Design a protein around this motif. Sequence first.
Motif, PDB file in Angstrom:
ATOM      1  N   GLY A  35       0.947  -1.296   0.059  1.00  0.00           N
ATOM      2  CA  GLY A  35      -0.071   0.043  -0.074  1.00  0.00           C
ATOM      3  C   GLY A  35       0.918   1.012   0.094  1.00  0.00           C
ATOM      4  O   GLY A  35       2.005   1.344   0.390  1.00  0.00           O
ATOM      5  N   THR A  36       0.111   2.413  -0.449  1.00  0.00           N
ATOM      6  CA  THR A  36       0.948   3.687  -0.325  1.00  0.00           C
ATOM      7  C   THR A  36      -0.130   4.509   0.445  1.00  0.00           C
ATOM      8  O   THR A  36      -1.383   4.511   0.303  1.00  0.00           O
ATOM      9  CB  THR A  36       1.051   4.330  -1.792  1.00  0.00           C
ATOM     10  N   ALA A  37       0.449   5.302   1.395  1.00  0.00           N
ATOM     11  CA  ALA A  37      -0.103   6.531   2.339  1.00  0.00           C
ATOM     12  C   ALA A  37       0.297   7.785   1.758  1.00  0.00           C
ATOM     13  O   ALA A  37       1.795   7.795   1.738  1.00  0.00           O
ATOM     14  CB  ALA A  37       0.008   6.294   3.793  1.00  0.00           C
ATOM     15  N   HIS A  38      -0.494   8.899   1.571  1.00  0.00           N
ATOM     16  CA  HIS A  38      -0.054  10.151   0.930  1.00  0.00           C
ATOM     17  C   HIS A  38      -0.818  10.910   2.061  1.00  0.00           C
ATOM     18  O   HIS A  38      -1.916  11.004   2.554  1.00  0.00           O
ATOM     19  CB  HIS A  38      -0.688  10.669  -0.208  1.00  0.00           C
ATOM     20  N   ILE A  39       0.264  11.965   2.824  1.00  0.00           N
ATOM     21  CA  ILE A  39      -0.414  12.920   3.828  1.00  0.00           C
ATOM     22  C   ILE A  39      -0.160  14.209   3.502  1.00  0.00           C
ATOM     23  O   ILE A  39       1.018  14.473   3.042  1.00  0.00           O
ATOM     24  CB  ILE A  39       0.421  12.432   5.448  1.00  0.00           C
ATOM     25  N   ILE A  40      -1.030  15.354   3.474  1.00  0.00           N
ATOM     26  CA  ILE A  40      -0.825  16.624   2.887  1.00  0.00           C
ATOM     27  C   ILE A  40      -1.383  17.573   3.978  1.00  0.00           C
ATOM     28  O   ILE A  40      -2.507  17.245   4.797  1.00  0.00           O
ATOM     29  CB  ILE A  40      -1.248  16.891   1.721  1.00  0.00           C
ATOM     30  N   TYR A  41      -0.849  18.855   4.476  1.00  0.00           N
ATOM     31  CA  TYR A  41      -1.284  19.802   5.236  1.00  0.00           C
ATOM     32  C   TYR A  41      -0.768  21.062   4.437  1.00  0.00           C
ATOM     33  O   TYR A  41       0.637  21.242   4.153  1.00  0.00           O
ATOM     34  CB  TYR A  41      -0.619  19.567   6.683  1.00  0.00           C
ATOM     35  N   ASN A  42      -1.530  22.130   4.690  1.00  0.00           N
ATOM     36  CA  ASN A  42      -0.942  23.489   4.045  1.00  0.00           C
ATOM     37  C   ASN A  42      -1.692  24.555   5.084  1.00  0.00           C
ATOM     38  O   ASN A  42      -2.732  24.063   5.666  1.00  0.00           O
ATOM     39  CB  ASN A  42      -0.990  23.775   2.650  1.00  0.00           C
ATOM     40  N   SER A  43      -1.053  25.365   5.488  1.00  0.00           N
ATOM     41  CA  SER A  43      -1.369  26.585   6.409  1.00  0.00           C
ATOM     42  C   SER A  43      -2.434  27.453   5.820  1.00  0.00           C
ATOM     43  O   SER A  43      -2.996  28.413   6.421  1.00  0.00           O
ATOM     44  CB  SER A  43      -0.261  27.316   6.887  1.00  0.00           C
ATOM     45  N   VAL A  44      -2.679  27.399   4.551  1.00  0.00           N
ATOM     46  CA  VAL A  44      -3.760  28.269   3.725  1.00  0.00           C
ATOM     47  C   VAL A  44      -5.211  27.548   4.165  1.00  0.00           C
ATOM     48  O   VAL A  44      -6.044  28.332   4.674  1.00  0.00           O
ATOM     49  CB  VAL A  44      -3.396  28.451   2.530  1.00  0.00           C
ATOM     50  N   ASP A  45      -5.476  26.462   3.763  1.00  0.00           N
ATOM     51  CA  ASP A  45      -6.629  25.572   4.136  1.00  0.00           C
ATOM     52  C   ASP A  45      -6.775  25.122   5.579  1.00  0.00           C
ATOM     53  O   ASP A  45      -7.959  24.821   5.948  1.00  0.00           O
ATOM     54  CB  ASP A  45      -6.748  24.395   3.137  1.00  0.00           C
ATOM     55  N   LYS A  46      -5.516  24.876   6.324  1.00  0.00           N
ATOM     56  CA  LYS A  46      -5.626  24.534   7.866  1.00  0.00           C
ATOM     57  C   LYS A  46      -6.253  23.311   7.680  1.00  0.00           C
ATOM     58  O   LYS A  46      -7.249  23.048   8.655  1.00  0.00           O
ATOM     59  CB  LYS A  46      -6.205  25.709   8.583  1.00  0.00           C
ATOM     60  N   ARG A  47      -6.022  22.439   6.905  1.00  0.00           N
ATOM     61  CA  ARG A  47      -6.887  21.037   6.561  1.00  0.00           C
ATOM     62  C   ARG A  47      -5.498  19.735   6.431  1.00  0.00           C
ATOM     63  O   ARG A  47      -4.889  19.766   5.680  1.00  0.00           O
ATOM     64  CB  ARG A  47      -7.603  20.928   5.518  1.00  0.00           C
ATOM     65  N   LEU A  48      -5.858  19.150   7.425  1.00  0.00           N
ATOM     66  CA  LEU A  48      -4.811  17.801   7.334  1.00  0.00           C
ATOM     67  C   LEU A  48      -5.642  16.795   6.804  1.00  0.00           C
ATOM     68  O   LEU A  48      -6.857  16.221   7.299  1.00  0.00           O
ATOM     69  CB  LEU A  48      -4.429  17.250   8.504  1.00  0.00           C
TER      70      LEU A  48
ATOM     71  N   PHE B   1       3.552  20.722   4.511  1.00  0.00           N
ATOM     72  CA  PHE B   1       4.364  19.493   4.709  1.00  0.00           C
ATOM     73  C   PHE B   1       3.460  18.438   3.745  1.00  0.00           C
ATOM     74  O   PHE B   1       2.356  18.690   3.599  1.00  0.00           O
ATOM     75  CB  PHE B   1       4.620  19.077   5.997  1.00  0.00           C
ATOM     76  N   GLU B   2       4.352  17.281   3.387  1.00  0.00           N
ATOM     77  CA  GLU B   2       3.793  16.340   2.837  1.00  0.00           C
ATOM     78  C   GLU B   2       4.660  15.038   3.020  1.00  0.00           C
ATOM     79  O   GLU B   2       5.956  15.308   3.210  1.00  0.00           O
ATOM     80  CB  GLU B   2       3.653  16.413   1.298  1.00  0.00           C
ATOM     81  N   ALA B   3       3.903  13.732   3.496  1.00  0.00           N
ATOM     82  CA  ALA B   3       4.774  12.659   3.538  1.00  0.00           C
ATOM     83  C   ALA B   3       4.030  11.702   2.808  1.00  0.00           C
ATOM     84  O   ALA B   3       2.858  11.559   2.401  1.00  0.00           O
ATOM     85  CB  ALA B   3       4.528  12.588   5.142  1.00  0.00           C
ATOM     86  N   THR B   4       4.760  10.757   2.264  1.00  0.00           N
ATOM     87  CA  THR B   4       4.562   9.565   1.498  1.00  0.00           C
ATOM     88  C   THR B   4       5.270   8.316   2.226  1.00  0.00           C
ATOM     89  O   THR B   4       6.357   8.357   2.172  1.00  0.00           O
ATOM     90  CB  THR B   4       4.850   9.684  -0.045  1.00  0.00           C
ATOM     91  N   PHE B   5       4.597   7.276   2.444  1.00  0.00           N
ATOM     92  CA  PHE B   5       5.289   5.922   2.721  1.00  0.00           C
ATOM     93  C   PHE B   5       4.638   4.667   2.100  1.00  0.00           C
ATOM     94  O   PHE B   5       3.370   4.874   1.790  1.00  0.00           O
ATOM     95  CB  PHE B   5       5.511   5.627   4.195  1.00  0.00           C
ATOM     96  N   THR B   6       5.294   3.639   1.791  1.00  0.00           N
ATOM     97  CA  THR B   6       4.752   2.431   1.082  1.00  0.00           C
ATOM     98  C   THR B   6       5.037   1.322   2.217  1.00  0.00           C
ATOM     99  O   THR B   6       6.143   1.566   2.973  1.00  0.00           O
ATOM    100  CB  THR B   6       5.386   1.982  -0.132  1.00  0.00           C
ATOM    101  N   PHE B   7       4.212   0.662   2.376  1.00  0.00           N
ATOM    102  CA  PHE B   7       3.947  -0.333   3.611  1.00  0.00           C
ATOM    103  C   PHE B   7       3.544  -1.727   3.074  1.00  0.00           C
ATOM    104  O   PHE B   7       2.808  -1.813   2.015  1.00  0.00           O
ATOM    105  CB  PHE B   7       3.238   0.149   4.634  1.00  0.00           C
ATOM    106  N   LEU B   8       3.973  -2.798   3.819  1.00  0.00           N
ATOM    107  CA  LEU B   8       3.438  -4.090   3.445  1.00  0.00           C
ATOM    108  C   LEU B   8       3.127  -4.781   4.993  1.00  0.00           C
ATOM    109  O   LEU B   8       3.892  -4.952   5.712  1.00  0.00           O
ATOM    110  CB  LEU B   8       4.774  -5.133   2.852  1.00  0.00           C
ATOM    111  N   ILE B   9       1.809  -4.937   5.056  1.00  0.00           N
ATOM    112  CA  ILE B   9       1.214  -5.375   6.356  1.00  0.00           C
ATOM    113  C   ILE B   9       0.759  -6.957   6.054  1.00  0.00           C
ATOM    114  O   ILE B   9      -0.373  -6.908   5.075  1.00  0.00           O
ATOM    115  CB  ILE B   9       0.026  -4.536   6.820  1.00  0.00           C
ATOM    116  N   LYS B  10       1.319  -7.813   6.654  1.00  0.00           N
ATOM    117  CA  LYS B  10       0.854  -9.269   6.324  1.00  0.00           C
ATOM    118  C   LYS B  10       0.731  -9.934   7.824  1.00  0.00           C
ATOM    119  O   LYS B  10       1.374 -10.003   8.554  1.00  0.00           O
ATOM    120  CB  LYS B  10       1.952  -9.945   5.567  1.00  0.00           C
ATOM    121  N   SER B  11      -0.526 -10.667   7.872  1.00  0.00           N
ATOM    122  CA  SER B  11      -0.928 -11.214   9.154  1.00  0.00           C
ATOM    123  C   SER B  11      -1.135 -12.710   8.578  1.00  0.00           C
ATOM    124  O   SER B  11      -1.853 -13.090   7.813  1.00  0.00           O
ATOM    125  CB  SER B  11      -1.962 -11.009   9.658  1.00  0.00           C
TER     126      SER B  11
END
Lengths: 237, 237
Positions: free
Chosen positions: A48-61, A191-201
Amino acid sequence: ADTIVAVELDTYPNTDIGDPSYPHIGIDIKSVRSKKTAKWNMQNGKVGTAHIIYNSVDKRLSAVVSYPNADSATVSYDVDLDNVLPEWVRVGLSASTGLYKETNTILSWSFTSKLKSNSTHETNALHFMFNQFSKDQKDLILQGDATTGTDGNLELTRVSSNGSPQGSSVGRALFYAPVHIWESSAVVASFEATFTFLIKSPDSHPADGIAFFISNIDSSIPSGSTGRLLGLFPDAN
Amino acid sequence: ADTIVAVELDTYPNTDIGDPSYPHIGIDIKSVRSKKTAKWNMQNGKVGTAHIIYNSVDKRLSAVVSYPNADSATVSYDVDLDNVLPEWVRVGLSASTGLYKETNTILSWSFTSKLKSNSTHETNALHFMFNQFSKDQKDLILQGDATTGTDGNLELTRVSSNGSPQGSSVGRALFYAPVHIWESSAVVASFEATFTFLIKSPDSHPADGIAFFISNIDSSIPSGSTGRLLGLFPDAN
Ligand SMILES: O=C(NCCO[C@H]1O[C@H](CO)[C@@H](O)[C@H](O)[C@@H]1O)c1ccc(-c2cc(-c3ccc(C(=O)NCCO[C@H]4O[C@H](CO)[C@@H](O)[C@H](O)[C@@H]4O)cc3)cc(-c3ccc(C(=O)NCCO[C@H]4O[C@H](CO)[C@@H](O)[C@H](O)[C@@H]4O)cc3)c2)cc1
Ligand SMILES: [Ca+2]
Ligand SMILES: [Ca+2]
Ligand SMILES: [Mn+2]
Ligand SMILES: [Mn+2]
């Protein structure tokens, strides 16, 4: 205690502490009880891929989690991180297991922060990108059970040599350099953050999840934060 | 003793330790006695720009110093930095004064490092950019006389409240995070650094200069390295 803002990929519903009754992505402001959640159709053993974004104009995470050839889950919350976080922070990833368990494997992680000013008209910026983690990664602070260099991956929680995840595990990785996340004389902070992850149970009963978080610089794993508290919070308030 | 690679902007002719008769830019590999130099038509009190570049394909460290409306000075040296530096380093700026003095003011500093693998066929990177320095810049380590905040500038050496530079001063600023500068599994390792600087001597007799440097992570100012040693070297060997 620490101050935490986090985006949780929560694989185990703890209905006694406000989780919905399904795997969910959530936005956490100073509590494991998400200010907002969205249903997540988590796919056992796929990248999977997670993308996180915040900007101080919209003040929305906002956050989006996706897999190839499947619909995204997205969640957003209006929050002014100026009123929540200190001016300087560390950024990191956290994961945990409890009675139930999963691989919390990170394959890549990138982050960009920018302060654009006008009074002194020039921008301050930090960008890092990890596509490969090595055995002795000196630009990361590893806490608890986190290790690097196994197939060039970051393992946030304990995995045995044959690839079996361990229960009651917690671990985190913070970027070494403090980040200037807001400043009240900037016109745009983002700011922005991206990570790719492998979750296996293996039991295909996965727990507990992975979070991207932002903390006070000196943040450490709170006592008793394995399982539902995702290595972020001391209690369920 | 520290391992140092540096590009010196050397304002003062220390002709007994091999400096030429004039202000010069130099490449320093483990000695203040530059392996290569070029004449620098230094302009008292105008803002200059320095650009430093290296890649593991050419194994060539180069630098260009320029002012608006003037001919650049450039200097290059063939060196294989993986035979010289440790794998993990810090990057910084250094300056000093001795009997003679100058403001050693940094207005901006940016750095980019990249390691491109073939294992993943994927890249690790760090970029920072400072266009404004704040009073409490937690992503910098300041050593010796260096301070931040005054007009949003980094002052590597001691200046009085009205802008008079002090003699016998030395100071350095290092990026907080260690940098992964080479790895033998990478097919290309590269870095670039850019800084703008204001060097002003009221006596119209400037000393001693400014250097961009790469060191062992735990590098500190060698004892007695004011004046001709630019805060980089314990001696003139
Ligand atoms: O190789 C040369 N070549 C010629 C000149 O250089 C130029 O020339 C051309 C045009 O000018 C040009 O084409 C080129 O660009 C070229 O580079 C050369 C070699 C040396 C010197 C030089 C020498 C000395 C010096 C002084 C004293 C001694 C001495 O007495 N030693 C002791 C005795 O030793 C001998 O005898 C004993 C007993 O028998 C034996 O045991 C020994 O083995 C010996 O045989 C030796 C050498 C000094 C200088 C010099 C010194 C000082 C300065 C200077 O400007 N100082 C200012 C103050 O310094 C402080 O402030 C500075 C500014 O802030 C800081 O940078 C400092 O760190 C201090 O804080 C300048 C020059 C030169 C010259 C050329
Ligand atoms: Ca949960
Ligand atoms: Ca000199
Ligand atoms: Mn939850
Ligand atoms: Mn020199």
